Amino acid sequence: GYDNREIVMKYIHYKLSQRGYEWDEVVHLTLRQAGDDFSRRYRRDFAEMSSQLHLTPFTARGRFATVVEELFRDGVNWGRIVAFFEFGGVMCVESVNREMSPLVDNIALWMTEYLNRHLHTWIQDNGGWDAFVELYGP
Numbered sequence: 001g002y003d004n005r006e007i008v009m010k011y012i013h014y015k016l017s018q019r020g021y022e023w024d025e026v027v028h029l030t031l032r033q034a035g036d037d038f039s040r041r042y043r044r045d046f047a048e049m050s051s052q053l054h055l056t057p058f059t060a061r062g063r064f065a066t067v068v069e070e071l072f073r074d075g076v077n078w079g080r081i082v083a084f085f086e087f088g089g090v091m092c093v094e095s096v097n098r099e100m101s102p103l104v105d106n107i108a109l110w111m112t113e114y115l116n117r118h119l120h121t122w123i124q125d126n127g128g129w130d131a132f133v134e135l136y137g138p
């Protein structure tokens with residue numbers, strides 16, 4: 001069984017716990033190893049994109065809508081997906097850090113919707129999660 005919401009709400013544990021939070025997922029072992037290596041490799045490219053959203057006047061929701069639009073602009077792929085989850089986590093880290101913990105619930109909700117209303121067709125088409133783990137699995 002695979003749940004986009006169960007993973008989206010639990011996958012935000014390693015991104016927050018590192019600073020101070022709760023929760024935990026079981027399949028994170030995959031997205032994690034793939035995410036950690038990403039942040040390190042594309043640390044600058046990622047940070048540069050993060051600052052951009054901070055410069056814009058948009059709100060918490062707006063930013064997420066702008067970061068998701070640019071990410072999946074020239075198509076989709078396991079790679080872009082690994083980055084999408086990365087941004088989501090960071091977005092929460094800033095909230096809790098900027099006295100906006102409650103926002104964490106919002107960001108977690110959005111990531112769940114988009115995943116179940118945008119990347120639900122592509123994923124299933126690319127062997128779904130089954131393939132995601134088969135490629136870059138523990």
Ligand SMILES: COC1(Cc2ccccc2)CCN(c2ccc(C(=O)NS(=O)(=O)c3ccc(NC(C)(C)CSc4ccccc4)c([N+](=O)[O-])c3)cc2)CC1
Nearest residue numbers: 034037038045046049067071078079080082083084087136
């Ligand atoms: C600034 O634009 C970004 C940042 C960003 C912008 C906006 C919103 C969110 C994020 C988002 C766009 N972006 C990239 C950079 C590269 C690729 C990439 O290499 N894709 S891939 O399809 O070639 C690939 C390679 C290797 C792995 N996994 C390994 C084998 C475990 C290595 S760790 C790794 C993870 C992912 C990418 C590279 C290495 C995985 N994966 O796990 O999905 C995927 C994809 C997007 C630049 C940073």
